[PDB]
Amino acid sequence: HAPVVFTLRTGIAEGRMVYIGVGGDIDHKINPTLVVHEGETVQVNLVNGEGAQHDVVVDQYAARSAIVNGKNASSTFSFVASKVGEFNYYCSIAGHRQAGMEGNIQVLPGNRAEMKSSGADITRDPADLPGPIGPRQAKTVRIDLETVEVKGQLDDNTTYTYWTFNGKVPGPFLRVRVGDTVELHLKNHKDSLMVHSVDFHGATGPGGAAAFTQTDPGEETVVTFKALIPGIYVYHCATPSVPTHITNGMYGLLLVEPEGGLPQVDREFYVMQGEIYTVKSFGTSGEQEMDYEKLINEKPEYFLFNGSVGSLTRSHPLYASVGETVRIFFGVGGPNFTSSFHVIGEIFDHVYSLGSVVSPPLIGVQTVSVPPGGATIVDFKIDRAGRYILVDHALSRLEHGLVGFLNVDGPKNDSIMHEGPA
Amino acid sequence: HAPVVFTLRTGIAEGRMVYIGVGGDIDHKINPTLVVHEGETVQVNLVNGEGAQHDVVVDQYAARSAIVNGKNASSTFSFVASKVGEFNYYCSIAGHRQAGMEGNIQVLPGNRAEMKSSGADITRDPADLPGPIGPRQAKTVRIDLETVEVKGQLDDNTTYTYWTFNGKVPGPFLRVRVGDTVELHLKNHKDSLMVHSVDFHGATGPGGAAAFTQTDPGEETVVTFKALIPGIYVYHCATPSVPTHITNGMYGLLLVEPEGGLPQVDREFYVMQGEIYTVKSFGTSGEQEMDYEKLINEKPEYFLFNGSVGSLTRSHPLYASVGETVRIFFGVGGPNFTSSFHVIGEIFDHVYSLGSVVSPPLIGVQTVSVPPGGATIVDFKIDRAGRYILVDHALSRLEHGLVGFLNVDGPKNDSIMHEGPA
Amino acid sequence: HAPVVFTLRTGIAEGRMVYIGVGGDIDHKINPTLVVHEGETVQVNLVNGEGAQHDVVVDQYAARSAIVNGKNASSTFSFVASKVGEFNYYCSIAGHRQAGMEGNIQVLPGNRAEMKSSGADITRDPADLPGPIGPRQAKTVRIDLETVEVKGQLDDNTTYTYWTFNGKVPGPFLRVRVGDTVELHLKNHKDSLMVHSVDFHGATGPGGAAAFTQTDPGEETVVTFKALIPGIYVYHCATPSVPTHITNGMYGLLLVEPEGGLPQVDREFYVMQGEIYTVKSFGTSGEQEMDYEKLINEKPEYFLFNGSVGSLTRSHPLYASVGETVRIFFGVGGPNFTSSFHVIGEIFDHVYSLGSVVSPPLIGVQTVSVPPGGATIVDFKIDRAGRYILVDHALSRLEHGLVGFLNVDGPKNDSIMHEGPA
Ligand SMILES: [Cu+2]
Ligand SMILES: [Cu+2]
Ligand SMILES: [Cu+2]
Ligand SMILES: [Cu+2]
Ligand SMILES: [Cu+2]
Ligand SMILES: [Cu+2]
Ligand SMILES: [Cu+2]
Ligand SMILES: [Cu+2]
Ligand SMILES: [Cu+2]
Ligand SMILES: [K+]
Ligand SMILES: [K+]
Ligand SMILES: [K+]
Q1: How far apart are the first and last CA of chain C?
Q2: Where does Cu(2+) 3 bind (chains A, B, C) (predicted)?
Q3: Domain C114-422 in the same topology as domain C1-113
């Protein structure tokens, strides 16, 4: 999977100069044992706590941080845990290892256990969308949405109150044809504390339907609307506080197909990015709560593909085969951040700028900016095997949970890319 | 209009466990009375101050926050104040109401009073722009700007020292034809403390004219420059500190029309987005001042359309009628934030990407990313009535002042969108 | 060149009411002497420290700040230091000058000394790139990169440990033709602490080559890959922590030319933007260190073109002649911020949107958003003389080191732009 990340701050604790764990399974632990599995890439973040000179050296891997001099000075490093066994990490500054700066890394055989928590799985499988529509004539299409507030899994051993369409994040991928009439039935579950609604960016009229869909707990609201313009549209709850309903999970995509349909492709995926603003820092376990000051001042703790940490890496990666042309419908619920959407190891053959399905897509593009409340379509042929990586290329976000895998099976070496000279 | 928002934090004050108001008319008040008008959507933000378990419950409205457990934990909720009267809000956790956590919501008949302050109205009416140039050959054209420093209204009961072109924000919409020779006369009002100037993105040469227009208070500067390339351009003061002059209000748009003009439209509108960085938190009344730390580190307090809170909702909303084709000239003065410009309930028929007027517009677009120092043009046919909502879809900005209304009269229900089934 | 900036906070120090220097050569100095050279533009930022009313008045220049009233209230102003000599600056509030609020501005003849420090010059000269490839057929091209960790100059009297391709930032501009087979040899210098590697956005396959290029210090890695799709591609180090390797300087551009080559142009330039996250605030001299909290929370201290403060203003400005058509290859290493790239005084004739070289470029564009992990190409005819200014139009970044000069010699006044009436 992604690197396993450990943060260590230096300090004086239990009477000695030591390292102290930050977050994860090591939170506030003195000289924590870092437990890792054979073959994992292990990342260690060292932050200087008290202002003495420090590093971290990993005894048999010859991996080390840079030296860190003043308070807050930091160094980050990694190594592949290729050998099972127990290995010391320690500070190499004169006297510090003797003063107390030493702990263990345990490299265990086997695979890391699956993520678990007391929360429900609220992730949307990225293969979970309707396929292309027929060559139909326009018609009336009934859509059902239910709004549910649910304790969900946010990360291993970490939970959060999500608010969702149909129990997952993003909500259902809706797919209709230009000219269709949509008849929406919105039910707000009876255990909901809040009113919920929906605004479709592909709808024309008051609140994008939100003026007709403010729905009390236990009740239903119904609204009919015409789909007048093809495009790939975000939709989201539109009940005040709107950025609050959105951060909690109430966002989705609505595709309005052009008359002829989109170009035919072998496989399509559904991916949306959002932020969560928790009182505790990213990586702290337990029951997380929303922090309003962080929300309104745009200070996110979690950045997420499809609802959760590890959603598209461990829970349900994308899977395709070599030679397939693939399409990702990519949307940004937000509420706030522009995504720089990129698939590492591949190139977008076509990018539907700003979600326009009528204009000719752009050709041969590495990375696309997608604003919150915006969506695009990217298509590309997969020429060869590999683990391709979905990222927002504001790469600090990798460490706030933002990473997905597109797994394509086949040989490591081929004529498109291979080790060694030509 | 837009929800009336109240922030309550919990804590201990006057010898009891209580709610304490934050900002607005309730700042620092204990168990404050929330005064509200019939028909308003009321939003309450609860932030846990001291770490006991809390909620807010509105007696008779069946409206409540989620329970908030640790310090900083937060819950936002809203409700429509449909019934006139006096209603209790209280904490439902055992003992907390008797302990002192209770206040009153007064729902008054009629409408909320207008916004007032000891500041001048510095807002640009969105219909305040010159219309299409006729068919003309290119000619010499005189433009007059005056830089004025003025105490303006920022919000209800709140003021700020604005720096402006001609006393409003954005400055005058300038409109010339490609090939025009522009003779710009820039006067700095004698009462200004600062020198002021102007850089047009549509100008070719030193500082986009800024090298020629550094103008001492009481002086006049004159520069002539040719408009070589059609487009929709931002202009702004360019005297150091340029971000300071921009945040204070010194930005506007220059349209350089292409040869046959832009497509004819029923109505054109002029809107610009910018930020203000105050010492005090958004929503705190009184005389506001610039915070330089917040400016250079991009931590805004106010995000604004046309200069002021309520600028395009209560002061000068956009007006149009059903069936009209409408144009928005939309620019970001900034200084720093890219806008995700979106009109809730409508779809952009045409988007002039990156403000290009020569390249073919994109078709059928929900949301347009516009950088600081950039502008765009969006055109759309308004198919039906409703109140349409201009926003930056980084939606936390909603609750920092960034919202606008485009009001279109007519029935709620029609064939394009109506309540109930098809 | 760019404004000389001094920051003063007010306070009580050494027993009086005074101004105190913040950063630069005045840091923590009481009533500091601001030393400046004839003809420089001087900017003073005044920040209220203790809460009494203050301003700053420059004697004889008649330049002053606005009055600042509460703690943190700020006001910036500037003046041109046109007269050599010594001039008092003082607070005009009653009693404050006698209470101690007074210092000196020393305006010296001649030019400011060149930036110096104990660090290596790590800046890429923007003219340092290979020119257009012949109209040859596809072939095998060898590329060599070495990854080196080096103490570099960040600013005058300030250094940082940069991690680089080939000792400069950005790395070498790489230039191949679509269809080429690229044989990349990556050497990691034996004095490196870290493994380093390479991900090319122009490569197709595992990690964009990163799966094949994790290189221990003192070792080499070789990988061959085909350039399948023309485009302007970012490449960067891809060893965990990736945003750490990127912020330290490991980013560059790879052009995969289309079959015909790019349109012919008179002069090409190579510019990249990135951020540095130091423990100390921007403008603090000395040996700087990375701050991981600032990195991962996206709170930068330096925004940089080509590696360093003053890199494109004083060290290696861009130079061209009137009449030339100029091309800038512009990319954002990041790791985090999208750039609003603009050349003050010019307009882009052609913008290759999202870095697509297959799609028709956009025409007549003032400013372009470039995401981190993305690049574009902008072409423009320079019609007349002037000092043109490359900026990211999120203009607070000017004060964080983000500015560049394009120098075009010739007359100040002409038909395109001149002082006085038409
Ligand atoms: Cu140590
Ligand atoms: Cu909702
Ligand atoms: Cu929306
Ligand atoms: Cu309580
Ligand atoms: Cu000005
Ligand atoms: Cu500008
Ligand atoms: Cu004073
Ligand atoms: Cu590296
Ligand atoms: Cu990348
Ligand atoms: K491909
Ligand atoms: K419409
Ligand atoms: K030009």
Answers
A1: 30
A2: 199, 201, 236, 393
A3: yes
What is the C-alpha separation between A270 and A406, in angstroms, rounded?
A: 12
Resolution, expressed in angstroms to one decimal: 2.2
Contact criterion met (CB < 8 Å) for A369 and C371: yes
Integer Cα distance of B8 and B104 in angstroms: 13
User: Per the omega criterion (within 30 degrees of 0), is the bond before C32 cis?
Assistant: no
CA atoms within a 13 Å half-sphere pointing along the CA-CB vector of C378? 25
Which residues sit opposite C86 in a β-bridge? C106
Class of domain B1-113: mainly beta
Å from CA of B144 to ligand 10 middle: 55
What single-letter amino acid sits at B96?
Answer: H
Structural domain boundaries in chain C: 1-113, 114-422
Strands of the sheet with A302-305, listed across from one edge: A302-305, A267-276, A325-334, A374-381, A348-351, A362-365
CA distance B30 to B17: 10
Distances (CA, A) of B42 to A238, B6, B81, C205: 14, 8, 7, 53
Give residue A49's identity as a one-letter amino acid code. Answer: G
Residue A105's Cα: distance from chain center in Å?
28
User: Cis peptide leading into A371, omega within 30 of 0?
Assistant: no
DSSP-derived secondary structure for C163-212: EEETTBBS---EEEETT-EEEEEEEE-TT-SS-B--EETT--SGGGGGGG
Q: Contact at 8 Å (CB) between A173 and A252?
A: yes
CB A198 within 8 A of CB A184: yes
The CATH number of domain A114-422 is 2.60.40.420: yes
Indicate the residue type of B83. K
Residue A277 has which token pair? 């603003």
Assess contact for A88 and A33: CB atoms under 8 A.
no
Place of tokens 């200070």: A299
Q: Do C369 and B374 touch (CB under 8 A)?
A: yes
- Tell me if C417 and B223 make a contact (CB, 8 A cut-off): yes
Interface with chain B: mutation pick from A194, A239, A275, A340, highest number of B CBs within 10 Å: A194
